[PDB]
RNA sequence: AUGAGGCUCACCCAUG
RNA sequence: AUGAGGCUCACCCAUG
RNA sequence: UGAGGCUCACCCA
RNA sequence: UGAGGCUCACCCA
């Protein structure tokens, strides 16, 4: 058993799919990275800690890079023109059962489901209106 | 046109579906709340601001309550035994096109897709392993 | 292979069996918990360390809870009336072969076998006499 | 009901079985040892005390010898190279009933049952993976 | 794509082959060891980390036992007289692509190929001359 | 004999093969470089030292460059965009015979053999999972 | 000596 | 390191 | 704690 | 900035 495995971060059908694979798990911080130049890679990190007596707290991070080539003095390197940073923290009381978590997850999936307000706004450089 | 509308936060097929509807949009902070007692309601807030010169930054929040009845002196009130707090911040450079955002969104949808590491861990009071 | 799998902690003839599963491997400490709220779960943790230049030390910890339903602030919460803690440390020389280690496991199995002195005293709230 | 009697520590199905028998009872600390020189014997000690006002605590200790290349009766130094030490401490709240204690024994039996992670990792000089 | 599997460390054409298999994964440091007491086993550990902002670094460690006059299972001291230690550190800039990395692996394969200086000097207790 | 000879560092089916040759033995450090400008050359260095009273230590270093053509001061110069560094130290007891040393070489050859875990992770920019 | 310490890589650091 | 030291249990204490 | 900031497991009030 | 905390658009280093 193990969930620290390779998975599809971006789904482009079956071709162009961005896959992220395990890379390091030091200090309680699991890290996934896509293939090729670390400089142009997608990155996902996750960790859980007992934030307070009654709370456990997940801290997840995602990085989406803008793949580009940097030329300098005629020396071209694979870099990331820029990066987009996702950064969430989920807090769950110790009284939550597996059923309660399953709900908390369905909530997060719904929040971003296609067509709903928030993901629709983000995908259009827009806000709410 | 408008995206500040009612939407399904939790999808339980077609029955038990948690729907959240607009409630207030003051100070650039859009807010959605489920029906019935505000005390046991789901809550979603979202806002966008120009964080720096080159960055725009979304700040999204979700609250999942544990619906319960509080009895005191024989007076029972609808309350929330506890609450789970989602709290994300997404940063996107001003050079991102609509195509780049569409990707950033597909990344977030994949992160939480059923069966993948992170949502699977959360739904089981577990961490990575 | 991979030995980080779920297993039956308390065997009750396939009915009322407390089965524990992998839940976290952060910081080199493997963890298993039962399908309960993290506040009423059985918990087993294991970890191996090269304690000395010529030794290895396994540290195993097991928590058995007495589940209950406390009514705090006039609200019902799943909780543990009390917990029983098992803490064991096994130190094995590096010179011990596999057939030497198999011998240690067998000793620990026979120690707690039904009907033998120790598990007999424990289960009857008495000492050895 | 005297439960201080000899028992089988290592069971090899009749042939090659290791029997441990009463050898000392000084200070309420019962001791069982095999029929060997004390430097190569299997030893088991066990005692109970009221650790604190809320708990009771069993302290069980097992010493198992390294047999591969052992020289029966001979002098083998350094001693730490030829012995593995087990060290258990079971804490049980004063509210635990006989039935509660039986469950705590079952939990310990299951922990070490054949084919489960822990006893499998140990018997192979491995950790969890 | 799980690449953490058993493999052949010492190949003697089928007969007398030394297989090393997964034995630990604590702290993201994967460990492989042969079927021996830990004092005489072949051991392999490997990990990756972002050494600096510009680099990534693999730290591979191999422990190989002295076999001539070895006493299988026995206690052999001093330990430093019966073990050879390998210690590799591969630094790879973040700009290196998969293809670049393949070439770096080929470079390492060639370094140690049969009949080349280095592996020839080592296998004969010699230096370069 | 004399083992200080040239050899193939990177094998590309006799075409595009990076062959390295002896270039310096000053200060007890044998050196090999490729037929390039000293600024874009592959470099391999080896040296043996009687580190301890009972040990010998081989220190091997390999540099793999990413050749490029920088335009400094408006002039074209052959240079290295970046370098990848391999640094290995092998410590072998003086008691190790030739057949013991041959065993070490074979272990290091199998470690990097195509298809095995480590060279597989390295060539795909990932860790072991 | 030891470090899953660091480098622009036969150098630097920490510890002991 | 060692403790038939302690806990609300991957923490605290004592000694050395 | 923050609709505090970042070159993102860092920094700030 | 933080794998800083919360009763969650607040507070902290």
Three-state SS string over chain D comes to CCCCCCEEEECCCCCCCEEEEEEECHHHCEEEECCCCCCCCCEEEEEEECCCCCEEEEEEEEEEECCCCCCCCCCCCCHHHCEEEEEEEEEEECCCCHHHHHHHHHHHHHHCCCCCHHHHHHCCCCCCC
**DSSP 3-state helix, strand, coil percentages of chain A (rounded to 5)?**
20, 50, 35
Per-residue HEC secondary structure of chain A comes to CCCCCCEEEECCCCCCCEEEEEEEEECCEEEEEECCCHHHCCEEEEEEECCCCCEEEEEEEEEEEEEEEEEECCEEEEEEEEEEEEEEEEEEECCCCHHHHHHHHHHHHHHHCCCCHHHHHHCCCCCCC
Domains of chain E by residue range? 1-129
From the CB coordinates, do chains F and B have 3 or more pairs under 8 Å?
A: no
Which residue in this structure is represented by tokens 């709220």? C37
Give me the numbers of helices (H) and strands (E) for chain C, helices first please: 2, 6
d(CA A114, CA A118): 9
Closest to C96 measured CA to CA, from C105, C87, C84, C88: C105
Closest to E32 measured CA to CA, from F43, F121, B18, F55: F121
SS3 F81: strand
Closest to B80 measured CA to CA, from B95, B65, B93: B65
Q: Is the CB of D51 under 7 A from strand H?
A: yes
Distance E52 CA to G6 C1' (A): 8
Give me the numbers of helices (H) and strands (E) for chain E, helices first please: 2, 6
**CA D83, D109, D111 angle in degrees (round to 5)?**
75
d(CA F108, CA F110): 5
Give me the half-sphere count of Cα atoms (radius 13 Å) on the Cβ side of residue F26.
Answer: 2
**CA B85, A59, B111 angle in degrees (round to 5)?**
90
Closest to E117 measured CA to CA, from F47, F17, C6, F103: F47
- Copy the structure tokens of residue A119: 């993901």
d(CA C20, CA C32): 6
d(CA B46, CA B31): 7
Q: Which residue is nearest to nucleotide J9 (CA to C1')?
A: B29
d(CA F24, CA F40): 17
d(CA B68, CA B78): 6
Closest to F114 measured CA to CA, from E115, E100, E86, E106: E106
The full length of chain D comes to 129
According to DSSP, residue D81 is labeled G
Closest to F102 measured CA to CA, from E69, E122, E112, E86: E122
Please report, in angstroms and rounded to a whole number, the separation of the first and last CA atoms in chain C.
45
Closest to B18 measured CA to CA, from B30, B6, B31: B6
Pick from E2, E96, E97: which is nearest to A5 by CB?
Answer: E2
Strand F43-49 vs strand F30-34: parallel, antiparallel, or unpaired?
Answer: antiparallel
d(CA D1, CA D12): 28
- Copy the structure tokens of residue F122: 């390295």
CB neighbours of residue D115 within 10 Å: 9
Q: Which residues of D8-41 are buried (b: 16+ CB within 10 A; e: fewer)?
A: ebbbeeeeeebebeebeeeeeebbbbbeeeeebb
Which residue in this structure is represented by tokens 């591979």? E60
Which residue in this structure is represented by tokens 């052999």? E76
Q: Is the CB of D56 under 7 A from strand H?
A: no
d(CA F67, CA C45): 51
Chain CA centroid to CA E117, Å? 19
Q: Between A98-112 and B98-112, two packed helices, what is the crossing angle to 10 degrees?
A: 170
Q: Do A111 and B86 touch (CB under 8 A)?
A: yes
Note if the bond before E78 is cis, omega within 30 degrees: yes
d(CA B105, CA D65): 61
Distance B95 CA to J7 C1' (A): 40
d(CA B31, CA C43): 40
A76 touches chain B (CB under 8 A): no
Closest to D47 measured CA to CA, from C127, F122, C36: C127
Distance (Å) from the C-alpha of residue B74 to the closest C-alpha of chain C? 10
Which residue in this structure is represented by tokens 């009766």? D73
The full length of chain C comes to 129
SS3 E103: helix
Distance (Å) from the C-alpha of residue F129 to the closest C-alpha of chain A? 6
- For E108, the enclosing helix (H) or strand (E) is helix E98-111
Sign of CA dihedral E5, E9, E13, E14: negative
A5 touches chain F (CB under 8 A): yes
d(CA F81, CA A75): 7
Give me the half-sphere count of Cα atoms (radius 13 Å) on the Cβ side of residue F80.
Answer: 17
SS3 B25: strand
Q: What fold, for C1-129? A: MS2 Viral Coat Protein (3.30.380)
Q: Do E37 and C98 touch (CB under 8 A)?
A: yes
Q: Do B128 and C25 touch (CB under 8 A)?
A: yes
Q: Is the CB of C46 under 7 A from strand H?
A: yes
Asked if residues C51 and C89 have their Cβ atoms less than 8 Å apart, the reply is no
Nearest-nucleotide field for A89 (CA, C1'): J3
- Copy the structure tokens of residue B108: 């977030």
Q: Dihedral of the CA atoms A7, A12, A14, A20 (nearest 10)?
A: -20
d(CA A124, CA F87): 49
Which residue in this structure is represented by tokens 């920088």? F70
Pick from E21, E37, E79: which is nearest to C96 by CB?
Answer: E37
- Copy the structure tokens of residue D107: 């939990």
CB neighbours of residue F16 within 10 Å: 8
Resolution of the determined structure in angstroms stands at: 3.3
Among left, alpha and beta (phi > 0; psi -120 to 50; other), residue F113 is beta
d(CA E21, CA E11): 14
Sign of CA dihedral A21, A24, A25, A31: negative
Give the CA distances from residue E92 to residues E80, E95, E100, in Å, rounded to whole numbers and listed in that order: 32, 8, 10
SS3 D105: helix
A-chain CB neighbours of F70 within 8 Å are 73-75
Nearest-nucleotide field for B47 (CA, C1'): I3
d(CA A120, CA F34): 56
d(CA E78, CA E64): 15
Q: Phi and psi of D116, rounded to 5°?
A: -80, 160
According to DSSP, residue B39 is labeled G
- Copy the structure tokens of residue D83: 């012995």
Give the CA distances from residue F66 to residues C109, D91, E101, F42, F84, in Å, rounded to whole numbers and listed in that order: 59, 62, 11, 10, 8
d(CA B40, CA F68): 64
Asked if residues B21 and B60 have their Cβ atoms less than 8 Å apart, the reply is no
Q: Do C8 and D113 touch (CB under 8 A)?
A: yes
Asked if residues A79 and A40 have their Cβ atoms less than 8 Å apart, the reply is yes
- Copy the structure tokens of residue B6: 């009612």
Distance D129 CA to H4 C1' (A): 35
- Copy the structure tokens of residue F10: 């990177």
**CA F23, F26, F29 angle in degrees (round to 5)?**
80
Distance D107 CA to H9 C1' (A): 17
* DSSP notation for C54-111: SEEEEEEEEEEEEEEEEEETTEEEEEEEEEEEEEEEEEEETT--HHHHHHHHHHHHHH
Q: Is the CB of B83 under 7 A from strand I?
A: no
Closest to B25 measured CA to CA, from B6, B8, B9, B47: B47
Asked if residues A122 and B98 have their Cβ atoms less than 8 Å apart, the reply is no
Q: Is the CB of B18 under 7 A from strand I?
A: no
Q: Is the CB of B61 under 7 A from strand I?
A: yes
- Copy the structure tokens of residue F6: 């040239």
Partnered with residue A88 across adjacent β-strands are A60, B88
SS3 D112: coil
Q: Is the CB of A108 under 7 A from strand I?
A: no
| A57 Cβ neighbours under 8 A, 6+ residues apart | A48, A49, A50, A51, A89, A90, A91, A92
Q: Do F122 and E10 touch (CB under 8 A)?
A: no
Q: Phi and psi of A52, rounded to 5°?
A: -140, -170
């Amino acid at each position: 058993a193990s969930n620290f495995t390779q998975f599809v971060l971006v789904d482009n059908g079956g071709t162009g799919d961005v896959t992220v694979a395990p890379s390091n798990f030091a200090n309680g911080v699991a890290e996934w990275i896509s293939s090729n130049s670390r400089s142009q890679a997608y990155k996902v990190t996750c960790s859980v800690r007992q934030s307070s007596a009654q709370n456990r707290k997940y801290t997840i991070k995602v990085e989406v890079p803008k793949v580009a080539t940097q030329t300098v003095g005629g020396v071209e390197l694979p870099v990331a023109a820029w990066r987009s940073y996702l950064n969430m923290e989920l807090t769950i009381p110790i009284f939550a059962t597996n059923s309660d978590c399953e709900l908390i997850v369905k909530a997060m999936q719904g929040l971003l489901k296609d067509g709903n307000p928030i993901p629709s706004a983000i995908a259009a450089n827009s806000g709410i209106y």
